[model samples]
Target: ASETFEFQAEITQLMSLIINTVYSNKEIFLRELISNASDALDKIRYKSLSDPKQLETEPDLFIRITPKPEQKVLEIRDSGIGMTKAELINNLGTIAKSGTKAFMEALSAGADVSMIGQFGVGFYSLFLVADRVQVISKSNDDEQYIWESNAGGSFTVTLDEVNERIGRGTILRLFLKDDQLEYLEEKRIKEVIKRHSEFVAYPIQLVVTKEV
Candidate 1:
Protein backbone atom coordinates (compact mmCIF):
# COMPACT_ATOMS: atom_id res chain seq x y z
CA ALA A 1 0.00 0.00 0.00
CA SER A 2 2.67 2.49 0.98
CA GLU A 3 5.24 3.55 -1.62
CA THR A 4 8.61 1.79 -1.44
CA PHE A 5 10.51 4.54 0.33
CA GLU A 6 12.78 3.11 3.02
CA PHE A 7 13.17 0.23 5.44
CA GLN A 8 12.32 0.91 9.06
CA ALA A 9 14.31 -0.30 12.11
CA GLU A 10 11.90 -3.10 12.99
CA ILE A 11 11.63 -4.18 9.39
CA THR A 12 15.40 -4.26 9.03
CA GLN A 13 15.57 -6.23 12.25
CA LEU A 14 13.02 -8.64 10.87
CA MET A 15 15.12 -9.26 7.78
CA SER A 16 18.18 -9.84 9.95
CA LEU A 17 16.21 -12.14 12.18
CA ILE A 18 15.26 -14.02 9.02
CA ILE A 19 18.87 -14.26 7.87
CA ASN A 20 20.17 -15.26 11.31
CA THR A 21 17.42 -17.17 13.11
CA VAL A 22 15.36 -18.65 10.30
CA TYR A 23 15.60 -22.23 9.02
CA SER A 24 18.26 -24.72 10.01
CA ASN A 25 17.60 -27.30 7.31
CA LYS A 26 17.34 -26.38 3.63
CA GLU A 27 15.18 -29.45 2.96
CA ILE A 28 12.48 -28.11 5.30
CA PHE A 29 12.31 -24.96 3.21
CA LEU A 30 11.62 -26.99 0.10
CA ARG A 31 9.00 -29.03 1.94
CA GLU A 32 7.22 -25.95 3.25
CA LEU A 33 7.10 -24.32 -0.20
CA ILE A 34 5.87 -27.51 -1.83
CA SER A 35 3.23 -27.86 0.87
CA ASN A 36 1.98 -24.35 0.20
CA ALA A 37 1.82 -25.04 -3.53
CA SER A 38 -0.19 -28.19 -2.77
CA ASP A 39 -2.53 -26.05 -0.67
CA ALA A 40 -3.04 -23.71 -3.64
CA LEU A 41 -3.78 -26.64 -5.92
CA ASP A 42 -6.30 -27.90 -3.37
CA LYS A 43 -7.99 -24.47 -3.38
CA ILE A 44 -8.31 -24.44 -7.19
CA ARG A 45 -9.50 -28.07 -7.27
CA TYR A 46 -12.12 -27.31 -4.60
CA LYS A 47 -13.34 -24.32 -6.61
CA SER A 48 -13.39 -26.37 -9.81
CA LEU A 49 -15.72 -28.90 -8.18
CA SER A 50 -18.25 -26.11 -7.45
CA ASP A 51 -17.76 -24.15 -10.71
CA PRO A 52 -17.75 -26.34 -13.80
CA LYS A 53 -16.27 -23.45 -15.80
CA GLN A 54 -13.09 -23.52 -13.70
CA LEU A 55 -12.73 -27.25 -14.17
CA GLU A 56 -13.06 -26.78 -17.93
CA THR A 57 -10.54 -23.95 -17.92
CA GLU A 58 -7.93 -25.65 -15.70
CA PRO A 59 -8.41 -29.36 -15.43
CA ASP A 60 -5.05 -30.51 -14.14
CA LEU A 61 -3.67 -29.48 -10.75
CA PHE A 62 -0.03 -30.36 -10.17
CA ILE A 63 3.28 -29.23 -8.66
CA ARG A 64 6.41 -29.62 -10.80
CA ILE A 65 10.03 -29.16 -9.73
CA THR A 66 12.43 -28.75 -12.62
CA PRO A 67 16.06 -28.94 -11.55
CA LYS A 68 18.63 -27.35 -13.81
CA PRO A 69 22.14 -28.46 -12.88
CA GLU A 70 23.93 -26.64 -15.70
CA GLN A 71 22.21 -23.42 -14.66
CA LYS A 72 22.14 -24.40 -10.97
CA VAL A 73 18.45 -23.54 -10.92
CA LEU A 74 15.56 -25.56 -9.48
CA GLU A 75 12.17 -24.20 -10.52
CA ILE A 76 9.13 -25.37 -8.56
CA ARG A 77 6.03 -24.49 -10.52
CA ASP A 78 2.33 -24.81 -9.70
CA SER A 79 -0.94 -24.23 -11.58
CA GLY A 80 -2.65 -22.63 -8.61
CA ILE A 81 -4.24 -19.22 -8.32
CA GLY A 82 -1.51 -16.87 -9.46
CA MET A 83 -0.97 -13.51 -7.75
CA THR A 84 -1.44 -9.91 -8.94
CA LYS A 85 1.24 -7.23 -8.42
CA ALA A 86 -0.42 -5.81 -5.32
CA GLU A 87 -1.05 -9.29 -4.03
CA LEU A 88 2.57 -10.18 -4.67
CA ILE A 89 3.84 -7.18 -2.72
CA ASN A 90 1.31 -7.31 0.10
CA ASN A 91 1.32 -11.07 0.32
CA LEU A 92 5.09 -11.36 0.00
CA GLY A 93 6.18 -8.06 1.51
CA THR A 94 4.96 -7.95 5.13
CA ILE A 95 3.10 -10.05 7.68
CA ALA A 96 -0.58 -9.26 6.99
CA LYS A 97 -2.23 -12.03 9.03
CA SER A 98 -3.60 -10.64 12.28
CA GLY A 99 -4.42 -14.02 13.80
CA THR A 100 -0.96 -15.41 13.03
CA LYS A 101 0.69 -12.29 14.38
CA ALA A 102 -1.44 -12.40 17.49
CA PHE A 103 -0.64 -16.06 18.02
CA MET A 104 3.10 -15.46 17.60
CA GLU A 105 2.89 -12.40 19.84
CA ALA A 106 1.21 -14.48 22.50
CA LEU A 107 3.88 -17.15 22.13
CA SER A 108 6.58 -14.52 22.46
CA ALA A 109 4.87 -13.35 25.62
CA GLY A 110 5.24 -16.91 26.97
CA ALA A 111 1.88 -18.28 25.78
CA ASP A 112 1.88 -22.05 25.34
CA VAL A 113 0.83 -22.28 21.73
CA SER A 114 2.47 -22.89 18.33
CA MET A 115 1.76 -21.08 15.05
CA ILE A 116 2.97 -21.69 11.51
CA GLY A 117 4.83 -19.07 9.48
CA GLN A 118 2.93 -16.31 7.69
CA PHE A 119 1.34 -17.14 4.33
CA GLY A 120 3.13 -16.34 1.05
CA VAL A 121 6.27 -15.52 3.02
CA GLY A 122 7.02 -19.26 2.94
CA PHE A 123 8.49 -18.66 -0.54
CA TYR A 124 11.13 -16.60 1.20
CA SER A 125 12.60 -19.94 2.31
CA LEU A 126 14.18 -20.22 -1.13
CA PHE A 127 16.35 -17.31 -0.11
CA LEU A 128 17.83 -19.59 2.55
CA VAL A 129 19.66 -21.44 -0.25
CA ALA A 130 19.47 -19.34 -3.41
CA ASP A 131 21.38 -16.18 -4.10
CA ARG A 132 18.55 -14.84 -6.23
CA VAL A 133 15.00 -16.12 -6.76
CA GLN A 134 12.90 -15.35 -9.84
CA VAL A 135 9.15 -15.90 -9.82
CA ILE A 136 7.52 -16.22 -13.27
CA SER A 137 3.80 -16.18 -12.55
CA LYS A 138 0.56 -15.51 -14.49
CA SER A 139 -2.90 -15.09 -13.02
CA ASN A 140 -6.41 -15.46 -14.39
CA ASP A 141 -7.12 -12.00 -12.96
CA ASP A 142 -4.17 -9.97 -14.36
CA GLU A 143 -0.94 -9.85 -16.39
CA GLN A 144 2.15 -11.88 -15.43
CA TYR A 145 4.29 -10.35 -12.68
CA ILE A 146 7.95 -11.24 -12.09
CA TRP A 147 9.00 -10.81 -8.48
CA GLU A 148 12.76 -10.84 -7.84
CA SER A 149 14.51 -10.79 -4.49
CA ASN A 150 17.52 -12.12 -2.52
CA ALA A 151 16.31 -11.52 1.05
CA GLY A 152 18.06 -8.16 0.89
CA GLY A 153 17.02 -4.62 1.69
CA SER A 154 14.69 -4.36 -1.34
CA PHE A 155 13.07 -6.37 -4.16
CA THR A 156 12.07 -5.53 -7.72
CA VAL A 157 8.64 -6.29 -9.19
CA THR A 158 8.19 -5.91 -12.94
CA LEU A 159 5.92 -6.96 -15.76
CA ASP A 160 7.38 -10.18 -17.19
CA GLU A 161 8.59 -9.73 -20.79
CA VAL A 162 8.81 -13.41 -21.66
CA ASN A 163 6.87 -15.54 -24.14
CA GLU A 164 3.33 -16.19 -22.87
CA ARG A 165 3.23 -19.84 -23.85
CA ILE A 166 2.53 -21.01 -20.31
CA GLY A 167 -1.25 -21.18 -19.79
CA ARG A 168 -1.07 -20.05 -16.14
CA GLY A 169 1.10 -20.94 -13.13
CA THR A 170 3.76 -19.80 -10.66
CA ILE A 171 7.40 -20.63 -11.51
CA LEU A 172 9.82 -20.26 -8.58
CA ARG A 173 13.42 -20.72 -9.71
CA LEU A 174 15.79 -21.24 -6.83
CA PHE A 175 19.51 -20.75 -7.32
CA LEU A 176 20.85 -23.09 -4.67
CA LYS A 177 23.54 -21.94 -2.26
CA ASP A 178 27.26 -22.67 -2.48
CA ASP A 179 27.41 -25.47 0.10
CA GLN A 180 23.94 -26.92 -0.48
CA LEU A 181 24.59 -29.00 -3.57
CA GLU A 182 22.95 -32.22 -2.40
CA TYR A 183 19.70 -30.86 -3.81
CA LEU A 184 21.03 -31.60 -7.28
CA GLU A 185 20.71 -35.31 -6.65
CA GLU A 186 17.34 -36.73 -7.72
CA LYS A 187 17.34 -39.31 -4.96
CA ARG A 188 17.78 -36.67 -2.27
CA ILE A 189 14.95 -34.54 -3.70
CA LYS A 190 12.55 -37.48 -3.75
CA GLU A 191 13.57 -38.47 -0.26
CA VAL A 192 12.68 -35.00 0.95
CA ILE A 193 9.30 -35.14 -0.74
CA LYS A 194 8.53 -38.66 0.43
CA ARG A 195 9.54 -37.93 3.98
CA HIS A 196 7.45 -34.79 4.44
CA SER A 197 4.76 -35.10 1.74
CA GLU A 198 4.23 -38.63 0.47
CA PHE A 199 0.44 -38.79 0.17
CA VAL A 200 -0.12 -35.21 -0.99
CA ALA A 201 -3.14 -34.82 -3.24
CA TYR A 202 -0.95 -34.16 -6.31
CA PRO A 203 1.96 -35.96 -7.88
CA ILE A 204 5.56 -34.67 -7.36
CA GLN A 205 8.07 -35.85 -9.91
CA LEU A 206 11.72 -34.91 -10.30
CA VAL A 207 13.63 -33.77 -13.38
CA VAL A 208 15.50 -37.07 -13.52
CA THR A 209 13.72 -40.40 -13.41
CA LYS A 210 13.59 -42.30 -10.11
CA GLU A 211 13.42 -46.05 -9.34
CA VAL A 212 9.72 -46.89 -9.29
Candidate 2:
Protein backbone atom coordinates (compact mmCIF):
# COMPACT_ATOMS: atom_id res chain seq x y z
CA ALA A 1 0.00 0.00 0.00
CA SER A 2 1.26 3.45 -0.88
CA GLU A 3 0.73 6.46 1.32
CA THR A 4 1.38 10.10 0.61
CA PHE A 5 2.50 12.53 3.24
CA GLU A 6 2.90 16.26 3.30
CA PHE A 7 6.19 17.70 4.41
CA GLN A 8 6.29 20.00 7.38
CA ALA A 9 6.31 23.68 6.57
CA GLU A 10 9.96 23.91 7.53
CA ILE A 11 10.97 21.12 5.18
CA THR A 12 8.96 22.50 2.32
CA GLN A 13 10.67 25.86 2.72
CA LEU A 14 14.07 24.28 3.18
CA MET A 15 13.62 22.28 0.00
CA SER A 16 12.92 25.48 -1.88
CA LEU A 17 16.12 26.92 -0.46
CA ILE A 18 18.04 23.83 -1.49
CA ILE A 19 16.72 23.96 -5.02
CA ASN A 20 17.39 27.68 -5.26
CA THR A 21 20.71 28.12 -3.45
CA VAL A 22 22.36 25.40 -1.34
CA TYR A 23 24.07 23.56 -4.19
CA SER A 24 25.15 26.06 -6.78
CA ASN A 25 26.48 23.51 -9.28
CA LYS A 26 24.98 20.14 -10.24
CA GLU A 27 28.17 18.08 -9.90
CA ILE A 28 28.02 18.23 -6.12
CA PHE A 29 24.79 16.25 -6.22
CA LEU A 30 26.63 13.03 -7.03
CA ARG A 31 29.28 13.85 -4.46
CA GLU A 32 26.72 14.22 -1.70
CA LEU A 33 24.86 11.03 -2.65
CA ILE A 34 28.09 9.01 -2.80
CA SER A 35 29.14 10.41 0.55
CA ASN A 36 25.84 9.36 2.09
CA ALA A 37 26.11 5.93 0.51
CA SER A 38 29.56 5.47 2.00
CA ASP A 39 28.19 6.39 5.39
CA ALA A 40 25.37 3.86 5.04
CA LEU A 41 27.84 1.12 4.14
CA ASP A 42 29.98 2.01 7.12
CA LYS A 43 27.05 1.80 9.49
CA ILE A 44 26.11 -1.67 8.30
CA ARG A 45 29.65 -2.98 8.59
CA TYR A 46 29.82 -1.66 12.14
CA LYS A 47 26.51 -3.28 13.06
CA SER A 48 27.34 -6.61 11.46
CA LEU A 49 30.41 -6.93 13.67
CA SER A 50 28.34 -6.81 16.87
CA ASP A 51 25.64 -9.11 15.48
CA PRO A 52 26.84 -11.68 13.01
CA LYS A 53 23.22 -12.12 11.91
CA GLN A 54 23.14 -8.49 10.91
CA LEU A 55 24.45 -9.33 7.48
CA GLU A 56 23.66 -12.45 5.51
CA THR A 57 27.09 -12.48 3.94
CA GLU A 58 30.52 -11.08 4.61
CA PRO A 59 30.44 -7.36 3.90
CA ASP A 60 31.65 -6.16 0.55
CA LEU A 61 30.88 -2.48 0.44
CA PHE A 62 30.73 -0.92 -2.98
CA ILE A 63 28.85 1.66 -5.03
CA ARG A 64 27.58 1.31 -8.58
CA ILE A 65 26.66 4.25 -10.78
CA THR A 66 24.76 3.83 -14.04
CA PRO A 67 23.98 6.60 -16.45
CA LYS A 68 21.16 6.02 -18.95
CA PRO A 69 21.23 8.54 -21.74
CA GLU A 70 18.21 7.19 -23.62
CA GLN A 71 16.04 6.98 -20.52
CA LYS A 72 17.38 10.27 -19.16
CA VAL A 73 18.02 8.67 -15.81
CA LEU A 74 20.99 8.31 -13.48
CA GLU A 75 21.12 5.53 -10.94
CA ILE A 76 23.38 5.32 -7.93
CA ARG A 77 23.26 1.99 -6.15
CA ASP A 78 25.09 0.96 -3.01
CA SER A 79 25.57 -2.19 -1.00
CA GLY A 80 24.76 -0.78 2.40
CA ILE A 81 22.30 -0.52 5.26
CA GLY A 82 18.93 0.03 3.71
CA MET A 83 16.20 2.09 5.32
CA THR A 84 12.94 0.97 6.90
CA LYS A 85 9.64 2.72 6.24
CA ALA A 86 9.85 4.84 9.35
CA GLU A 87 13.38 5.86 8.47
CA LEU A 88 12.34 6.87 4.98
CA ILE A 89 9.68 9.15 6.43
CA ASN A 90 11.90 10.50 9.17
CA ASN A 91 14.88 11.09 6.92
CA LEU A 92 13.14 12.19 3.73
CA GLY A 93 9.58 13.11 4.49
CA THR A 94 9.34 15.73 7.22
CA ILE A 95 11.47 18.23 9.12
CA ALA A 96 10.03 17.19 12.44
CA LYS A 97 12.83 17.44 15.03
CA SER A 98 15.27 18.49 12.32
CA GLY A 99 17.37 21.64 12.68
CA THR A 100 16.47 22.67 9.15
CA LYS A 101 14.19 25.43 10.38
CA ALA A 102 16.83 26.87 12.65
CA PHE A 103 19.34 26.77 9.84
CA MET A 104 16.96 28.61 7.56
CA GLU A 105 16.26 31.19 10.24
CA ALA A 106 19.95 31.74 10.86
CA LEU A 107 20.57 32.21 7.16
CA SER A 108 17.71 34.68 6.88
CA ALA A 109 19.27 36.59 9.79
CA GLY A 110 22.52 36.71 7.77
CA ALA A 111 24.70 35.28 10.52
CA ASP A 112 27.86 34.75 8.49
CA VAL A 113 26.39 31.71 6.59
CA SER A 114 27.84 28.17 6.17
CA MET A 115 24.84 26.27 7.47
CA ILE A 116 24.43 23.84 4.56
CA GLY A 117 27.87 22.32 5.11
CA GLN A 118 27.60 22.39 8.89
CA PHE A 119 24.04 21.14 9.32
CA GLY A 120 24.15 18.67 6.41
CA VAL A 121 21.29 19.18 3.97
CA GLY A 122 23.46 17.57 1.36
CA PHE A 123 20.91 14.84 0.57
CA TYR A 124 18.52 17.40 -0.80
CA SER A 125 21.16 18.33 -3.35
CA LEU A 126 19.52 15.78 -5.63
CA PHE A 127 17.04 18.47 -6.63
CA LEU A 128 19.91 20.32 -8.23
CA VAL A 129 19.53 18.14 -11.32
CA ALA A 130 16.46 16.00 -10.75
CA ASP A 131 12.80 16.84 -10.91
CA ARG A 132 11.96 13.51 -9.34
CA VAL A 133 13.89 10.98 -7.30
CA GLN A 134 12.97 7.38 -6.60
CA VAL A 135 14.56 5.26 -3.90
CA ILE A 136 14.33 1.49 -3.58
CA SER A 137 15.82 -0.07 -0.49
CA LYS A 138 15.78 -3.43 1.24
CA SER A 139 16.87 -3.56 4.83
CA ASN A 140 18.09 -6.61 6.67
CA ASP A 141 14.97 -6.83 8.81
CA ASP A 142 12.44 -5.17 6.55
CA GLU A 143 10.85 -5.89 3.21
CA GLN A 144 11.67 -3.85 0.12
CA TYR A 145 10.13 -0.38 -0.13
CA ILE A 146 9.90 2.45 -2.58
CA TRP A 147 10.12 6.18 -1.86
CA GLU A 148 9.29 8.76 -4.47
CA SER A 149 9.40 12.50 -4.25
CA ASN A 150 9.72 15.45 -6.55
CA ALA A 151 11.34 17.60 -3.88
CA GLY A 152 8.00 19.27 -3.64
CA GLY A 153 5.69 19.70 -0.63
CA SER A 154 4.98 16.00 -0.43
CA PHE A 155 6.39 12.53 -1.00
CA THR A 156 5.00 9.02 -1.14
CA VAL A 157 6.21 5.75 0.32
CA THR A 158 4.86 2.29 -0.30
CA LEU A 159 5.44 -1.40 0.00
CA ASP A 160 7.24 -2.42 -3.17
CA GLU A 161 4.59 -4.42 -4.98
CA VAL A 162 7.09 -5.52 -7.57
CA ASN A 163 9.30 -6.72 -4.74
CA GLU A 164 12.47 -5.69 -6.51
CA ARG A 165 14.99 -6.84 -3.97
CA ILE A 166 18.52 -5.59 -3.62
CA GLY A 167 19.35 -8.07 -0.84
CA ARG A 168 20.63 -5.40 1.59
CA GLY A 169 21.17 -2.03 -0.09
CA THR A 170 19.72 1.09 -1.60
CA ILE A 171 19.24 2.43 -5.10
CA LEU A 172 18.48 5.98 -6.16
CA ARG A 173 17.04 6.84 -9.56
CA LEU A 174 17.19 10.46 -10.55
CA PHE A 175 14.77 11.68 -13.21
CA LEU A 176 16.86 14.47 -14.55
CA LYS A 177 15.76 17.83 -15.76
CA ASP A 178 16.36 18.79 -19.38
CA ASP A 179 18.98 21.43 -18.70
CA GLN A 180 20.90 19.07 -16.44
CA LEU A 181 21.16 16.24 -18.98
CA GLU A 182 24.92 16.66 -19.30
CA TYR A 183 25.24 14.77 -16.03
CA LEU A 184 24.58 11.61 -18.05
CA GLU A 185 27.94 11.96 -19.77
CA GLU A 186 30.40 9.20 -18.92
CA LYS A 187 33.41 11.51 -18.81
CA ARG A 188 31.55 14.01 -16.65
CA ILE A 189 30.34 11.39 -14.17
CA LYS A 190 33.80 9.84 -13.99
CA GLU A 191 35.38 13.22 -13.34
CA VAL A 192 32.95 14.03 -10.53
CA ILE A 193 33.35 10.60 -8.90
CA LYS A 194 37.13 10.75 -9.02
CA ARG A 195 37.24 14.32 -7.81
CA HIS A 196 34.91 13.69 -4.87
CA SER A 197 34.99 9.98 -4.14
CA GLU A 198 38.27 8.51 -5.40
CA PHE A 199 39.47 8.37 -1.82
CA VAL A 200 36.13 7.26 -0.40
CA ALA A 201 36.41 4.33 1.97
CA TYR A 202 34.25 2.07 -0.17
CA PRO A 203 34.98 0.81 -3.66
CA ILE A 204 32.90 2.77 -6.16
CA GLN A 205 32.50 1.26 -9.61
CA LEU A 206 30.96 3.32 -12.37
CA VAL A 207 29.38 1.17 -15.06
CA VAL A 208 30.03 3.19 -18.15
CA THR A 209 28.98 0.60 -20.69
CA LYS A 210 26.55 -2.28 -20.57
CA GLU A 211 27.75 -5.77 -21.47
CA VAL A 212 25.85 -7.26 -24.37
Candidate 3:
Protein backbone atom coordinates (compact mmCIF):
# COMPACT_ATOMS: atom_id res chain seq x y z
CA ALA A 1 0.00 0.00 0.00
CA SER A 2 1.09 3.53 -0.72
CA GLU A 3 0.74 6.67 1.39
CA THR A 4 -0.77 9.82 0.00
CA PHE A 5 0.41 13.35 0.67
CA GLU A 6 -0.73 16.79 -0.36
CA PHE A 7 1.42 19.66 -1.45
CA GLN A 8 1.32 22.74 0.74
CA ALA A 9 -1.23 25.31 -0.46
CA GLU A 10 1.47 27.78 -1.34
CA ILE A 11 3.56 25.19 -3.10
CA THR A 12 0.60 23.98 -5.10
CA GLN A 13 -0.18 27.49 -6.29
CA LEU A 14 3.43 28.13 -7.17
CA MET A 15 3.64 24.94 -9.16
CA SER A 16 0.53 25.94 -11.04
CA LEU A 17 2.17 29.19 -12.02
CA ILE A 18 5.38 27.44 -13.04
CA ILE A 19 3.57 24.89 -15.15
CA ASN A 20 1.10 27.23 -16.79
CA THR A 21 2.74 30.62 -16.86
CA VAL A 22 6.44 30.71 -16.04
CA TYR A 23 7.82 28.24 -18.54
CA SER A 24 7.42 29.52 -22.05
CA ASN A 25 9.37 26.63 -23.55
CA LYS A 26 8.44 23.12 -22.58
CA GLU A 27 11.71 21.67 -23.91
CA ILE A 28 13.52 23.20 -20.97
CA PHE A 29 11.95 20.51 -18.84
CA LEU A 30 14.44 17.99 -20.19
CA ARG A 31 17.35 20.23 -19.38
CA GLU A 32 16.22 20.84 -15.82
CA LEU A 33 15.73 17.12 -15.24
CA ILE A 34 19.09 16.17 -16.76
CA SER A 35 20.80 18.89 -14.82
CA ASN A 36 19.30 17.45 -11.64
CA ALA A 37 20.54 13.99 -12.57
CA SER A 38 24.08 15.28 -13.03
CA ASP A 39 23.90 16.99 -9.66
CA ALA A 40 22.93 13.68 -8.08
CA LEU A 41 25.91 11.97 -9.72
CA ASP A 42 28.14 14.75 -8.47
CA LYS A 43 26.97 14.25 -4.90
CA ILE A 44 27.63 10.52 -4.95
CA ARG A 45 31.01 11.03 -6.58
CA TYR A 46 31.88 13.60 -3.94
CA LYS A 47 30.84 11.27 -1.13
CA SER A 48 32.83 8.42 -2.67
CA LEU A 49 35.86 10.68 -2.64
CA SER A 50 35.96 10.52 1.18
CA ASP A 51 34.71 6.91 1.41
CA PRO A 52 35.72 4.84 -1.59
CA LYS A 53 33.64 1.92 -0.37
CA GLN A 54 30.49 3.72 -1.55
CA LEU A 55 31.72 3.20 -5.10
CA GLU A 56 32.07 -0.54 -4.82
CA THR A 57 28.81 -1.18 -6.70
CA GLU A 58 28.47 2.14 -8.49
CA PRO A 59 31.83 2.86 -10.05
CA ASP A 60 30.91 4.40 -13.37
CA LEU A 61 28.37 7.19 -13.53
CA PHE A 62 26.20 8.03 -16.53
CA ILE A 63 22.75 9.20 -17.58
CA ARG A 64 20.55 7.21 -19.96
CA ILE A 65 17.52 8.61 -21.78
CA THR A 66 14.99 6.39 -23.48
CA PRO A 67 12.11 7.54 -25.68
CA LYS A 68 9.15 5.28 -26.35
CA PRO A 69 7.15 7.10 -28.97
CA GLU A 70 4.59 4.40 -29.43
CA GLN A 71 3.76 4.42 -25.77
CA LYS A 72 4.16 8.15 -25.33
CA VAL A 73 6.68 7.76 -22.57
CA LEU A 74 10.12 9.21 -21.87
CA GLU A 75 12.48 7.84 -19.23
CA ILE A 76 15.62 9.43 -17.85
CA ARG A 77 17.86 7.25 -15.69
CA ASP A 78 20.96 8.15 -13.77
CA SER A 79 23.61 6.28 -11.84
CA GLY A 80 23.86 8.82 -9.04
CA ILE A 81 22.91 9.64 -5.50
CA GLY A 82 19.44 8.22 -5.14
CA MET A 83 17.01 9.50 -2.47
CA THR A 84 15.62 7.69 0.50
CA LYS A 85 11.88 7.74 1.22
CA ALA A 86 12.10 10.66 3.61
CA GLU A 87 14.34 12.58 1.27
CA LEU A 88 11.99 11.97 -1.64
CA ILE A 89 9.06 13.34 0.31
CA ASN A 90 11.07 16.27 1.52
CA ASN A 91 12.61 16.97 -1.86
CA LEU A 92 9.72 16.29 -4.22
CA GLY A 93 6.50 16.18 -2.24
CA THR A 94 6.90 19.51 -0.49
CA ILE A 95 8.41 22.82 -1.52
CA ALA A 96 10.28 25.83 -0.14
CA LYS A 97 10.43 24.35 3.33
CA SER A 98 13.58 22.53 2.27
CA GLY A 99 15.85 25.58 2.63
CA THR A 100 15.18 26.64 -0.95
CA LYS A 101 14.90 30.32 -0.08
CA ALA A 102 18.18 30.25 1.84
CA PHE A 103 19.88 28.62 -1.11
CA MET A 104 18.49 31.22 -3.48
CA GLU A 105 19.60 33.98 -1.15
CA ALA A 106 23.13 32.59 -1.31
CA LEU A 107 22.86 32.47 -5.09
CA SER A 108 21.99 36.15 -5.05
CA ALA A 109 25.05 36.59 -2.86
CA GLY A 110 27.24 35.36 -5.74
CA ALA A 111 26.78 31.59 -5.53
CA ASP A 112 26.68 29.66 -8.75
CA VAL A 113 23.28 29.45 -10.42
CA SER A 114 24.47 26.21 -12.03
CA MET A 115 23.84 24.65 -8.66
CA ILE A 116 20.15 24.48 -9.68
CA GLY A 117 19.39 21.32 -7.80
CA GLN A 118 19.27 23.47 -4.70
CA PHE A 119 16.34 25.42 -6.10
CA GLY A 120 14.10 22.48 -5.12
CA VAL A 121 11.43 23.15 -7.73
CA GLY A 122 13.16 21.98 -10.89
CA PHE A 123 11.65 18.52 -10.41
CA TYR A 124 8.19 19.96 -10.91
CA SER A 125 9.16 21.05 -14.41
CA LEU A 126 8.20 17.57 -15.57
CA PHE A 127 4.60 18.77 -15.61
CA LEU A 128 5.34 21.05 -18.51
CA VAL A 129 5.46 18.03 -20.82
CA ALA A 130 4.05 15.20 -18.84
CA ASP A 131 0.61 14.59 -17.43
CA ARG A 132 1.97 11.96 -15.09
CA VAL A 133 5.42 11.25 -13.71
CA GLN A 134 6.77 8.18 -11.98
CA VAL A 135 10.00 8.10 -10.03
CA ILE A 136 11.85 4.95 -8.99
CA SER A 137 14.92 5.30 -6.88
CA LYS A 138 17.27 3.36 -4.60
CA SER A 139 19.50 4.95 -1.99
CA ASN A 140 22.45 3.35 -0.22
CA ASP A 141 20.67 3.75 3.11
CA ASP A 142 17.16 2.65 2.19
CA GLU A 143 15.29 0.18 0.01
CA GLN A 144 13.92 1.16 -3.36
CA TYR A 145 10.76 3.25 -3.47
CA ILE A 146 8.39 4.65 -6.06
CA TRP A 147 6.98 8.17 -6.08
CA GLU A 148 4.23 9.14 -8.47
CA SER A 149 2.04 12.09 -9.31
CA ASN A 150 -0.30 13.25 -12.04
CA ALA A 151 0.33 16.96 -11.46
CA GLY A 152 -2.81 16.90 -9.35
CA GLY A 153 -1.43 18.75 -6.36
CA SER A 154 -0.88 15.53 -4.45
CA PHE A 155 1.43 12.54 -4.77
CA THR A 156 1.92 9.05 -3.44
CA VAL A 157 4.99 7.09 -2.39
CA THR A 158 5.23 3.38 -1.91
CA LEU A 159 7.75 0.61 -1.49
CA ASP A 160 8.68 -0.70 -4.91
CA GLU A 161 7.67 -4.31 -5.38
CA VAL A 162 7.76 -4.69 -9.13
CA ASN A 163 11.27 -3.68 -10.08
CA GLU A 164 13.87 -6.36 -9.42
CA ARG A 165 16.07 -3.65 -7.96
CA ILE A 166 18.22 -0.70 -8.86
CA GLY A 167 21.45 -0.79 -6.88
CA ARG A 168 21.73 2.99 -6.58
CA GLY A 169 20.08 5.59 -8.82
CA THR A 170 16.90 7.28 -9.93
CA ILE A 171 14.66 6.77 -12.96
CA LEU A 172 12.02 9.31 -13.99
CA ARG A 173 9.31 8.10 -16.35
CA LEU A 174 7.28 10.83 -17.94
CA PHE A 175 3.93 10.07 -19.51
CA LEU A 176 3.99 12.63 -22.24
CA LYS A 177 0.92 14.69 -22.95
CA ASP A 178 -0.93 14.26 -26.25
CA ASP A 179 0.42 17.41 -27.88
CA GLN A 180 3.86 16.71 -26.39
CA LEU A 181 4.39 13.73 -28.66
CA GLU A 182 7.32 15.50 -30.31
CA TYR A 183 9.35 14.85 -27.19
CA LEU A 184 9.20 11.13 -27.92
CA GLU A 185 11.06 11.54 -31.21
CA GLU A 186 14.74 10.70 -31.27
CA LYS A 187 15.63 13.69 -33.40
CA ARG A 188 13.76 16.12 -31.21
CA ILE A 189 15.21 14.61 -28.06
CA LYS A 190 18.73 14.86 -29.46
CA GLU A 191 18.19 18.46 -30.45
CA VAL A 192 16.94 19.41 -27.01
CA ILE A 193 19.67 17.47 -25.23
CA LYS A 194 22.32 19.16 -27.33
CA ARG A 195 20.85 22.58 -26.81
CA HIS A 196 20.55 22.42 -23.03
CA SER A 197 22.64 19.55 -21.69
CA GLU A 198 25.38 18.75 -24.18
CA PHE A 199 28.09 20.24 -21.98
CA VAL A 200 27.01 18.64 -18.74
CA ALA A 201 29.85 16.98 -16.83
CA TYR A 202 28.26 13.53 -17.00
CA PRO A 203 27.89 11.17 -19.92
CA ILE A 204 24.37 11.18 -21.35
CA GLN A 205 23.22 8.43 -23.73
CA LEU A 206 20.04 8.33 -25.75
CA VAL A 207 18.48 4.99 -26.65
CA VAL A 208 16.95 5.24 -30.09
CA THR A 209 15.57 2.69 -32.49
CA LYS A 210 16.50 2.59 -36.15
CA GLU A 211 13.76 1.60 -38.51
CA VAL A 212 15.01 -1.10 -40.85
After the best TM-score superposition of candidate 1, give how far the Cα of residue 79 lies from its true spot, in angstroms: 1.0
With candidate 2 superimposed using the best TM-score fit, by how many Å does residue 90's alpha carbon deviate from the native?
A: 1.0
Cα misplacement distance, residue 5 of candidate 2 (Å): 1.1
lDDT of 1 by residue, 93-212 (tens): 654344334544554675432123443345545555677777777767677888776757666778877634355667887888776667877877888878878758898756764459
Q: What TM-score against the true fold does each predicted structure earn?
A: 0.77, 0.88, 0.85
Lowest-scoring 10 consecutive residues by lDDT in candidate 2? 111-120
- Give the whole-model CA lDDT for all candidates, comma-separated: 0.65, 0.80, 0.80
> Mind giving the per-residue lDDT tens digits that candidate 2 earns over 112-196?
2334545666677787788889998878878889999886799999998884567788899999988888888888888888986
lDDT of 2: 0.80
Comparing 2 and 3 on TM-score, the stronger one: 2
Instruction: Give the Å shift of residue 65 in candidate 1.
Output: 0.7
Summed backbone clashes in each candidate are 0, 0, 0
- RMSD in angstroms, all models? 4.5, 2.7, 4.4
Question: Residue 104: error of model 3 in Å?
Answer: 14
Task: Give the Cα error of residue 35 in candidate 3, in Å.
Answer: 0.9
Best by TM-score: 2
